[PDB]
Each structure stands twice: as C-alpha cells, then as structure tokens.
RNA sequence: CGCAAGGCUGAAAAAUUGACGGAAGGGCACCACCAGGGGUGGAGCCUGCGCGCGCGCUACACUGACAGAGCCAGCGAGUACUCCCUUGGCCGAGAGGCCCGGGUAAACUCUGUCGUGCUGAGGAAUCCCUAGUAAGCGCAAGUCAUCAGCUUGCGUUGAUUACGUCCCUGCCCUUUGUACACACCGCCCGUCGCUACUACCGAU
C-alpha cells in the first residue's frame, strides 16, 4: 500500500509539472480561440505556429469546458470533494496537559466527524502510517505552551498539503461553568469565509473547508443552526464557532459556543506531516526587508 | 441542556420566537420587561465576553459570575495608550 | 552584545542588557549580527538577570557580535558669543588647543583602531551521512568507504 | 465579525461545499431506479458510441481485466 | 558615471576587526566568511535531502548483480560495533595460495 | 476531435478516453486530446509491458535480464506467477509486481541485506 | 475634461411553499449511565490570563537508606560547542595570553549492613480517560510563527475496568422523498398563518 501512495505522490507531482508546461502553452492557444470568434488580428507567431494549429483543432473543447466551469482542476481535493464524509482525528503533542486535552476535546466537538486519539507513546511515522491505513481524511496536531495551545498542523491525506499555524487570543470551552455552557450541538455546520482573494487565500479556504462534511443542498439556505466563521485581516485568520436561531425573517440571534482563535499560518507544505523535507508552498517570510509590509492571503 | 436548546427555550418564554399568534391572541395580550430580559439573554449566551472560573469559589463562605471583561479592558487600555 | 549559548537558530545573548525591564521595553526588536544575519530580540531570559533570547536567520557563531542599531536624538547646545571685537570679547578655544593647554592626551580605543585581519583559507569538513540513512538507501547510491 | 455573521445568515450565502451526487457523470438527470442536419449529427454520435464500445472492449482485454 | 567621482569617493572603506579582549574565540565573521558558510552548509543539506528522498523511494525488492558480488551494509546487529552504513570496499589484498607463498618465502 | 466542440457526447467520451488511457499508463497526463493524437505510441505500450516496467521498478538491471528472469518464472504479479513476457502491467499493478514465493532471487536479495530468514 | 454629484428631510418582506411545537420510534456520545483509574483543588516556586484563577515544576517514607556485583535503548555530527566573575603571580614599553586558588541512560535484577526516627499523598467540588491507552522512567534536539520558568521529538517499563445500554443527561434523525423481489407496516397529533369562495356587521 505504501508503494501505492508513493507512486501516486510522484505521479501527481509529475502531472503538476506537466500542467505547468501545458498552461504556458494554453495561454497562447486562448488568444487564437478569442481572435477566431471576434476577428481582431492576432500575433504572427500565434498565427504561424503550425503545431499549435494541429493541437488546437484537437483540444478546443477542454478550454471551453474550463470557461463554462464544467470541469475541475487537478487537485488533491477534487477527487473526493463532496462524495464521502471526510473524517478527521485530533491528537495532542507527546505529553499532553489537562487543559490541552480539554481543548482538543473542544475542537473534536467542533468538527462533527472527528475522533480524538491519545498520543502516549506513538511515534509520528506510525501515526502517519495508521492514518493512511484507516483512510482518514485529515490529521491535526496541537502544541501547548503551558495549558494553552499555540500551534495546529492541519495535514491532509494521503499526500496532501499541511498548514502549520500559530494560535493566539485563544479562550477554551472549559473555563465557563457548565451552568452557562453545555453539550455543544453536533450538527453539520455552515461555513462563512471573509477576506480571501489571492490564489493562496483560495488554497487555504479549500484546505480548510474540506475538513467538514458536505451539506445536503435541498434546503441548506434555510435549515441548519450552527455556523463557523473564518475572517482574515493582515493574514491572521480569525475563527469563531457560533450557533444561531432565526427569530424572524429579518433578524437573527447569535450565541457563541466554541473556542475563539486567531490562527496565523506560518507554513503550507505540499507534503504531509511526516515529510519535513517536503517542498514548501508558502511560509511566513519574516526577517526580510518587506516581509511585514506584504500581505498574503 | 445545549446552548441552542436553552436559547430556544428562553426565547419561547420571552415570546420572541413563538408560533404566529392570531388576532384574538394579540387582543388577549393587549388586554393582559423584555428589553432587560433580552440584554440578560445576550449577556448570558455570549459568555466569552468575560473571563470566568469553572470551579467556582475555592471555599464556600455565605454572606449578604463575571470576573473581568478582557475586550472592554483592552479597548480602554488601548485608548489610554493612544492619548 | 555577545552570544552566550547558540542553538541551530535561537541564541541567547548576554552582555547587552542589564534587566528584564529593559528587555521588555526592547521586545520584538530588530537585532543584527556583524556577519549580516538579521534577527529578532524575542523574550527576556530569567535565571541570569539581563540575558535574552534572539531568533536569527541562520546559525550564528560564538565569534559573532550582535548589534542593535537605534537612533538617539541629539539637540545642539545653545551657546552664543557675540564677537564685539572693538570692545573686547572672550574667544572659546578649540579641542586641540584645550588639550595642548591642560595636558590631556587625545582618547583612543585599541579596539577601535584599524588593523589588518589574518584570514586563513576556510576549509570545511566533508559530508557526514548518518548511519541509518546510509544503511537504508538503495544499492544504486550506497556509499563505498574502504 | 458578529455583524458579518448576521449579514451572511440573513442573506444566506454559506461557503459550504455541497454534496454532489456520485454519478453525475454517467447519469446527468438522476433518474430513479425502479418502476418507470441533426440527423447527420446523431448518426455521427451513434458511430462514436459504437467505436467506443469496441475500443473499450479491446482495451480492457489488453489490460487483462484490471480496470 | 565613472569620471564623475573623485579619488576620495573611490577610496576604500577599512574593515574593522575582532576586539582584542575577545581575540581568543577566533576570527570575526564578516559578510564574505558568512557567504562561505552558507554555501557549504546549503550544499551539504542539498545532498542530504537528495539521499533522504532516495532512501524513502527505495524499492524493497531490487536486484542487481553487485548484490551477488559485494558485501552489503547489513545492520548494527549483524555488523556488530564496527558498523557504518557504507558497504566495505575491497582493499585489493587477497587470499594467496600455498605455492605462491612458498615462492615468496624462498625469496625472503 | 472532428465533432463540434460543444457536444456533450464529445466531452464525455474525451474524459473517458483520457481516464482509461491514463489508468492504463500509456499517457502521462489526462488533459490533452493532442497528447492522444501524437503521444499514444507502440513504444508507450512496449514500455508498459512487463520486463520494461520491472526495469523501471529496478527489479532487474536490464530489460534482457528481466526477460530471462520472468521466463524462468521468478516474477509474480499479485498472487499468480507470470511466465509470458508480454503481460501488460497497468498503473494499479505496478505497485504489486513482485518476486515469487520461494525464489532464489529473493533469497539472494535477503542475503545481501543480511536479513535472510530461513523460516 | 465630463457624468456620477441637488435633501417630503432631521440617530437608536414573501407564503397554495410560511411560524412554533407535542407523541411515538430509532441511532450516537467517557461534554451520558455503568466499573475503575488519574488530575487540579492542601504547602512552596514561577510563565501566563483577569490581589484572584488555573497549567506546569518541586517537596512530603516502606514503595526505606547505605554498600557491592551484573545487565539493557532511539532519534542526534554547519571548521561548530565553551556557565560565571574575580584574589594573586609569569611573560608582556602599552593592548593581551598564560599559571594557581574562591564562590556511552534512568531504570531493573541479585547480593549483604541497618531498622519507622518534622529524619506524613491533599476537602467540598470540578475535569479527563477504554490497549502499546493511563501511569512511571530518562536521553536527544531547539528547525523563519510559539517555546527556555519551557517546547517538541525519541526510546524503556506497561496494568485494573467497560467494551453493553439508551434507564438518567444530552445530541442527531426518522413521520416526505432517494430502488423493484420475498417479508412487515399501515391513513401520528396541536395552535395558527397564506390562498379561493360564501354570506354577515357597521361608518363613507
């Protein structure tokens, strides 16, 4: 099986490089299709590239289908997007403290298809092996400072990306009294996102919203009573977990039930949790001259 | 009880969410408060506005719960840091 | 300052501050080595009073010196002679004349004077592959060491 | 953030990935499984359908029924 | 330009040195020495990363014929204390037959 | 390619053809009918045959050595041995083409890595 | 450059598809029952958060002390790593370097000497936990965010008790759909909205 996962990872990276080359070509093919239906004159290299003419007559249809959005991009999520329910486990670091254990239980309650596993003495390659063995969608680590969490590592499987993010301003579920809080309602939640426009922001939105089960589309606009919000300002994505009831047609009442984070992503690696040598995709560029002026996501 | 169910129970007691009453029911009500009630409901059902201890007091002493507003305190200290 | 203990990235710096108060004033600061490595003063240390933790780009060396480049405001002095030459006036002497008058030598630092450095040709150690990796890699790239 | 949640919930636009039917490709209308010129173009489409049946048979048999 | 500056513009800036109260620790690392260190360490990390990729993507069922004519690295268990992951290389000395040893010993 | 570009059966059979060929490992991508037009190749089928795919998987040193081996009957794929050197390994069986059970080749590999388990 | 760019004005709906429930029946949950375990909460240290609160760390004796003997790990290699600051003295015109003083495991096993002796294991409450899990033990590293009052790895020793149940506490879902054979089941319930029509009541 591990042979199969290695083979698929290598073939996916090779198809990525092939898509890079073919997109460098198909930037030039699309000018030919647009100049055809319009009549505006085009560049002579485009007009006299004969191999481009043969290949264009072959492969018109995929560009048009991409324009109509009928087809999806070669991605780690478009294979199993909304067909299966992506189950996810949360663990702590090696020696968990009691507050980190309660916090992991809080976010295991936040994701409705999550299970929590104790680390104990569980070597991290055996963790990745067991996850790929039981077909888990995603894995989550947590690192405490002293009873307060500081880092998540959202890792997708079998070979997807990881997002390593630092946490601040966290308030745990397990500090308010049980007379005021209660058992959190486990329902399939809606998700709202705000501020993401770049391709990197879209990548983060995808690898975040592919941790939640897909919702039934027949009456999703009206039913459902629990929403999870991710807003970003100056690339520190802040997340709350609300549960709401709609007292009218023109007013709603909120009630904050989950933890609050302002997680700031400091790495996204194209390669899973065990692969420290995986090719990075974005990391928090500090110690440069303008790494604090530039705003990603 | 859960947060959602307790909130719905409190609003049905407050009459803000109940079934669509008839004109006869509106007459009965106009024959026979909610502001302070609703402010208490929002204060009690958004409990992360203020830092609270779960254990309660360590030693019970009887004589005659919020323990600080971190958002309000941060806004006030930031205004002082401004000025 | 001067490095005290040097890990792969983070390094503790000793002879730069006198107290955790001063460090907590200069928290989040843009420290810099002589070699060109930027870095950041991050958090005061506790057990020796005055030392701190800095996160650098790459591994700094025990021979390095950490500097912090701040800008101190200077204001001139408000002296004003009028040069009433026809009446008589006191002319303030200069630095060299003051020193030649009251017999004080000009200050100099032997740390400061320019000298020539002797750089030996920097040779590095060879590659040192760990035992388990060198045992586990396939037959095509197994190292052969007699 | 509370106001943005209120705006979204009222004018409901959630970014939830919606459960797509698993066989939208081979079954576009999703019929129930129980009790129930353009001529030149249709002829060409029938020709390609026959060609694809034949070539898929050849390709499966060449792959030795691992497909 | 290059004729629009004086010789005092062109005058080189001197390089400071390690303070004399700290000369024992070695030479003061300036920018050029730092670049030497960065190139060396990045090169070694590059080769180590390529070896890690190779050891990960090793097929466990390979079969050359050097595997019939060499002595593989084994494990710590089999090789004992003198165990480096490298395969032992042939020093060129060999086992000598008795006749040739008689001839060499007659010459000796 | 000769159908009009907007035709539903053209799109469905294009995706079907590309998926079938990529799963059978002839092509390298699954997005270019042009790659079907001048990339599908008897050389591609030949390199998807068994001895060359085990050469790429480094079972043997050369393709001649691989053919000699699997004619001697050392190489199973899945659970059944294969004696024909023309078996076409697809991209799901490339992860399963291994040696046979009591092979002298398997013993020699184990003896090289000094992990020969005689049980 | 032009349009945008002229104030009956002065802060706090849709519905033939809608609103809210009730009764029954299921399923799930160490935020539930059940059996046990372990924390925190007692004393001291301190990061943190708002004098207080938790999180870790240390100490508190039968599970003892002392002395011998034997026997076990894994991840770790950047011409790189050092805990101080000083009394003296050597060689130093001067800046320094020397020399001497002061402030690859834990464990475990076996064998003996001695005998409980300020030399006392944590209330109410509340939280967590079901197999290489709890817990004990040390070694390494310090990886652009966080972390030395610590963080993350890695190995070692490794149990008790459930592994059923919806009875309590909750959460979800059925009472519409989504598939056809055998086989079974047999019109769940309330208060209103909206719509069509019918006539009625009283002002203009």
Curated annotation (Swiss-Prot), chain E:
Summary of the function given for this chain in its UniProt record: Involved in nucleolar processing of pre-18S ribosomal RNA.
Gene: UTP11
Region (Disordered): 1-24
Subunit and interaction comment: Component of the ribosomal small subunit (SSU) processome composed of at least 40 protein subunits and snoRNA U3. Interacts with snoRNA U3.
Coiled coil: none
Ranges annotated as biased composition (Basic and acidic residues): 15-24
This protein's name: U3 small nucleolar RNA-associated protein 11
Similarity comment: Belongs to the UTP11 family.
Species this protein is from: Chaetomium thermophilum (strain DSM 1495 / CBS 144.50 / IMI 039719)
Localization annotation: Nucleus, Nucleolus
């Amino acid at each position: 099986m591990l042979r199969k996962q290695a083979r698929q990872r290598r073939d996916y990276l090779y198809r990525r490089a092939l898509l890079l080359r073919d997109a460098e070509i198909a930037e030039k093919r699309a000018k030919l299709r647009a100049a055809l239906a319009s009549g505006k004159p085009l560049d002579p290299k485009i007009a006299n590239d004969k191999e481009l003419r043969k290949d264009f007559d072959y492969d018109v249809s995929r560009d048009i289908a991409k324009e109509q959005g009928e087809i999806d991009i070669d991605d780690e999520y478009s294979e199993l997007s909304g067909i299966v329910d992506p189950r996810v486990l949360v663990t702590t670091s090696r020696d968990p403290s009691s507050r980190l254990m309660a916090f992991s239980k809080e976010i295991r309650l936040m994701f409705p298809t999550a299970i929590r596993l104790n680390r104990g003495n569980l070597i991290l390659p055996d963790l990745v092996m067991s996850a790929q063995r039981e077909r888990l969608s995603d894995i989550i680590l947590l690192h405490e400072h002293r009873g307060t969490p500081t880092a998540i590592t959202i890792s997708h499987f079998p070979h997807g990306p990881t997002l390593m993010a630092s946490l601040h301003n966290v308030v745990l579920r397990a500090d308010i009294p049980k007379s005021i809080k209660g058992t959190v309602s486990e329902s399939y939640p809606h998700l709202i996102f705000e501020g993401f426009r770049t391709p990197l922001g879209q990548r983060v939105v995808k690898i975040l919203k592919h941790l939640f089960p897909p919702r039934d589309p027949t009456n999703n606009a009206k039913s459902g009573n629990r929403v999870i919000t991710f807003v970003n300002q100056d690339d520190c994505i802040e997340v709350r977990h609300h549960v709401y009831v709609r007292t009218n047609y023109n007013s709603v009442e909120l009630s904050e039930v989950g933890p609050r984070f302002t997680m700031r992503p400091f790495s996204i690696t194209m390669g899973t949790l065990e692969n420290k040598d995986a090719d990075v995709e974005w990391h928090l560029s500090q110690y440069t001259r303008t790494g604090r002026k530039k705003n990603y996501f | 009880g859960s947060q959602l169910k307790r909130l719905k129970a409190s609003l049905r007691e407050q009459g803000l969410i109940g079934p669509q009453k008839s004109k006869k029911q509106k007459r009965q009500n106009a024959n026979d408060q909610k502001a302070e009630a609703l402010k208490s409901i929002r204060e009690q059902f958004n409990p992360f506005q203020f830092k609270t201890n779960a254990r309660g007091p360590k030693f019970e002493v009887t004589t005659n719960v919020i323990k600080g507003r971190p958002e309000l305190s941060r806004a006030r200290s930031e205004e002082k840091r401004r000025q | 300052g001067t490095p005290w203990k040097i890990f792969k990235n983070t390094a503790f710096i000793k002879d730069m501050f006198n107290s955790s108060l001063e460090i907590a004033k200069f928290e989040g600061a843009a420290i810099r080595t002589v070699s060109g490595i930027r870095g950041q003063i991050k958090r005061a240390l506790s057990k020796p009073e005055g030392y701190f933790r800095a996160t650098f780009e790459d591994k700094i060396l025990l021979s390095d010196i950490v500097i912090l480049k701040a800008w101190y405001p200077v204001k001139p002095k408000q002296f004003y002679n009028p040069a009433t030459n026809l009446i008589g006036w006191q002319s303030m002497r200069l630095t060299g004349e003051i020193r030649r008058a009251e017999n004080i030598p000009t200050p100099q630092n032997p740390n400061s004077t320019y000298r020539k450095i002797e750089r030996p040709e920097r040779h590095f150690n060879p590659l040192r592959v760990p035992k388990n990796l060198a045992a586990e890699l396939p037959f095509k790239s197994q190292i052969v060491q007699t | 953030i509370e106001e943005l949640i209120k705006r979204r919930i009222l004018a409901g636009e959630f970014d939830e990935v919606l459960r797509r039917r698993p066989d939208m490709f081979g079954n576009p209308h999703g019929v129930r499984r129980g009790l129930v010129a353009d001529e030149k173009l249709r002829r060409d489409e029938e020709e390609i359908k026959r060609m694809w049946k034949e070539i898929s048979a050849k390709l499966d048999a060449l792959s030795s029924w691992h497909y | 330009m290059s004729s629009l500056r004086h010789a005092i513009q062109r005058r080189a800036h001197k390089e400071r040195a390690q303070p004399l109260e700290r000369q024992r620790l070695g030479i003061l690392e300036k920018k050029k020495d730092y670049r030497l260190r960065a190139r060396d360490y990045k090169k070694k990390q590059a080769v180590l990363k390529s070896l890690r990729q190779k050891a990960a993507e090793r097929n466990e069922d390979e079969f050359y014929f050097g595997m019939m004519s060499r002595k593989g690295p084994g494990s710590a268990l089999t090789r004992g204390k003198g165990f480096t992951g490298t395969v032992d290389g042939d020093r060129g000395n060999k086992a000598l037959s008795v006749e040739t040893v008689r001839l060499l010993k007659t010459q000796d | 390619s000769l159908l009009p570009p907007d035709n539903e059966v053209r799109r469905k059979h294009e995706t079907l053809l590309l998926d079938k060929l990529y799963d059978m490992g002839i092509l390298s991508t699954k997005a270019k009918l042009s790659a079907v037009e001048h990339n599908v190749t008897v050389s591609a089928f030949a390199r998807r045959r068994l001895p060359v795919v085990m050469t790429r998987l480094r079972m043997a040193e050369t393709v001649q050595a691989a053919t000699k081996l699997i004619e001697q009957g050392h190489v199973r794929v899945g659970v059944e041995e294969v004696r024909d050197p023309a078996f076409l390994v697809t991209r799901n069986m490339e992860d399963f083409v291994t040696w046979t059970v009591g092979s002298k080749i398997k013993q020699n590999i184990m003896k090289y890595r000094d992990k020969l388990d005689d049980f």
